[PDB]
């Protein structure tokens, strides 16, 4: 009652912070995907010719010295994925710092929570930019088809497919940005990450976030039976996605060569 009102205020705080931290929300992405926006339509990359035609227009200007390079397509795309992941880590870090209690945690525990939580959040939020046929890229300026990503040479063609599989099922839950803001906060505040020094304050924050999430889902999805339990299971599923992803990367580190990995991702993947 008094507790419930504070849980709504927390939910709203998190939503407002999510809006401040993440430029491309699910609402804005869905409008683009469905075609209900007045903005310019994304450039569709569905084959090698359209990749060539669109890549200079939508890629980041300062990934390489000259922007033109001799690396094969699959690696160029992988480098673009890294740049996007690095930006996402920075957005997620800013959001985490808005979660009440987070910045007062031991700083090494803040690091651990981000290190072991950011990829679960990346894949959650990637679903907002996906449908069964492709993914929005470059802040919504491009759309790369799932089939084209699958067509990439053996190692790289398998990177995104598990994320599309997750996204199609996750998107069937019809969460909105308000729901997602709390879900992501719950994931960040996971007290079972390896090497946490003081678990109790993290669990106490998470317990309150979980209560806020349950109330959010009951009010915002009154006809969606067991949605809270479903989201708890998606948290488990995301850990398995990340485990599988790390494995794919280890293969890359063995079979592939001349593989630059951004230092921020090197830190996250270490051990």
């Amino acid at each position: 009652g008094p507790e419930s009102a504070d849980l709504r205020a927390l939910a709203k705080h998190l939503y407002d912070s999510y809006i401040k931290s993440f430029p491309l929300t699910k609402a804005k992405a869905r409008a683009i995907l469905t075609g209900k926006t007045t903005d310019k339509s994304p450039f569709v990359i569905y084959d090698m010719n359209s990749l060539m035609m669109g890549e200079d227009k939508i890629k980041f200007k300062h990934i390489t010295p000259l922007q033109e390079q001799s690396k094969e397509v699959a690696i160029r795309i992988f480098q673009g994925c890294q740049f996007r992941s690095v930006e996402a880590v920075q957005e997620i870090t800013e959001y985490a710092k808005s979660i009440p209690g987070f910045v007062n945690l031991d700083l090494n525990d803040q690091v651990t929570l981000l290190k072991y939580g950011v990829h679960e959040i990346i894949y959650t939020m990637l679903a907002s930019l996906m449908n069964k046929d492709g993914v929005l890229i470059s802040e919504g300026q491009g759309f790369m088809t799932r089939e084209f990503l699958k067509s990439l040479r053996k190692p790289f063609g398998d990177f995104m497919e598990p994320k599309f599989e997750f996204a199609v099922k996750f998107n069937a839950l019809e969460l909105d940005d308000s729901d997602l803001a709390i879900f992501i906060a719950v994931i960040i505040l996971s007290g079972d990450r390896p090497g946490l020094l003081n678990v109790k304050p993290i669990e106490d924050i998470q317990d309150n976030l979980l209560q806020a999430l349950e109330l959010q889902l009951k009010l915002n999805h009154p006809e969606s039976s067991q949605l809270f339990a479903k989201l708890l299971q998606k948290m488990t599923d995301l850990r398995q996605i990340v485990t599988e992803h790390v494995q794919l990367l280890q293969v890359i580190k063995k079979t592939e060569t001349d593989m630059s990995l951004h230092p921020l991702l090197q830190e996250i993947y270490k051990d």
Binding site: V89, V103, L107, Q110, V111, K115, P263, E267, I268
Partner: peptide, 13 residues
């Protein structure tokens, strides 16, 4: 060795 995540966490607006 130094933590890039720690640097991000410590920067204010």
């Amino acid at each position: 060795e130094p933590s890039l995540l720690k640097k991000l966490l410590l920067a204010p607006a």
